[PDB]
């Protein structure tokens, strides 16, 4: 009885993640209006949540329901490395979009000159190269479950999640303070566009942080107080709560921004 319900829930989650990410990709690519330099990061995030669903999620589902691993160590290392790489390739795209918004808001009239398209291409290429190199030089070279230890496990929690979070919080606090202080930003329509896009980015970032904070807190604690310190139910509830964010993001994109809603309505 319970197994049927959980399998249906997992199938629904995978379905929503795949369908939503393909919808975002199709809408952004097809419609000319929605092709802008800020949406390059959003499409990258869409690909980075498309792959997690297409590949990582089905195996995690099988493993969770069956409760046994059978594919073998050779595949298992690929699956954990891939899983690790996609997380590193999502916490860097969020950083770049937040840098875009800080650059636009804090220094208006210089946004076109500073954020050149070549720079955006360099940023995406660098982000993927660093993600893949780190994932396979911390998977192939050492240091199915992620294996916490003395320095590898503790260091990753502090450097990957907690460090970008505080820079992003400082950037957003300053951006909100300037936004409140100033009266007119850049034409009235331009001001409203900047404010609405800033709201979109701030809500996507806050949703990501709220979804992934419990898992990383557990990850730090398991290093601090032992691998088996926490229960299994607490260990596996957080993972799925973290994974739900990929499905959740397309709904946020459509609801917050009118252009996404229009493009989706045209598409289907």
């Amino acid at each position, epitope marked *: 009885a319970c197994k049927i319900t959980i399998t249906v829930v997992l199938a629904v989650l995978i379905l929503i993640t795949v369908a939503g990410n393909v919808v975002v990709c199709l809408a952004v690519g097809l419609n000319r209006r929605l092709r802008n330099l800020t949406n390059c990061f959003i499409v990258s995030l869409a690909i980075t949540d498309l792959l997690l669903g297409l590949l990582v999620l089905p195996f995690s589902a099988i493993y969770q329901l069956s409760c046994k691993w059978s594919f073998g160590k050779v595949f298992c290392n690929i699956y954990t490395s891939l899983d690790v790489m996609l997380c590193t390739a999502s916490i860097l795209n969020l950083f770049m979009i937040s840098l875009d918004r800080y650059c636009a808001v804090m220094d208006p009239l210089r946004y076109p000159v500073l954020v050149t398209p070549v720079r955006v291409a360099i940023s995406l290429v660098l982000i993927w190269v660093i993600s893949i190199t780190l994932s396979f030089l911390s998977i192939h070279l050492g240091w199915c479950k992620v294996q916490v230890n003395e320095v590898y496990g503790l260091v990753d929690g502090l450097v990957t999640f907690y460090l970008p979070l505080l820079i992003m919080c400082v950037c957003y606090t300053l951006m*909100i303070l300037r936004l409140k202080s100033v*009266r*007119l930003l850049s034409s*009235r329509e331009k*001001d*409203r566009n900047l*404010r*609405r896009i*800033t*709201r979109l980015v701030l809500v996507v970032v806050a949703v990501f942080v709220i979804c992934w904070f419990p898992y990383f807190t557990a990850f730090v604690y398991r290093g601090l107080r032992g691998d088996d310190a926490i229960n299994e139910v607490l260990e596996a509830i957080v993972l799925w709560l973290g994974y739900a964010n990929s499905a959740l993001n397309p709904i946020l994109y459509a609801a917050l921004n009118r252009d996404f809603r229009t493009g989706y309505q045209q598409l289907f």
Partner: nanobody, 117 residues
């Protein structure tokens, strides 16, 4: 939100009337205009949140504008009132409903002033 205007009355020539406008996210500007029976709307004074002020040529040297930030109340003090100043003095306020919202404008109902007695 409602802009309440007051201080409108019949005044003998040479009299003084202090007007007051009360507005109930942020208020950026407040202005005063006068409309006479056969004349177009004319600006008399405007004040920013900072407190910078500009005046029309005729108004200059007789009208003063100041802003109370705490209570969101502005006033205009008219001195040396003359029959040319007979008009319905209208209040005007610029405000933002929310942090992400667009800037909007507000118009008062008008306080009628007659410089006769």
């Amino acid at each position: 939100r409602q802009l309440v205007e007051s201080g409108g009355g019949l005044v003998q020539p040479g009299g003084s009337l202090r007007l007051s406008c009360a507005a109930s996210f942020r208020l950026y500007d407040m202005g005063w205009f006068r409309q006479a029976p056969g004349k177009e709307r004319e600006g008399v004074a405007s004040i920013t949140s900072g407190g910078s002020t500009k005046y029309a040529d005729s108004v200059k040297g007789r009208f003063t504008i100041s802003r109370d930030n705490a209570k969101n109340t502005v006033y205009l003090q008219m001195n040396s009132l003359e029959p040319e100043d007979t008009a319905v003095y209208y209040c005007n306020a610029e405000y933002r409903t929310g942090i992400w919202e667009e800037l909007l404008d507000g118009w008062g109902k008008g306080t009628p002033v007659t410089v006769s007695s």
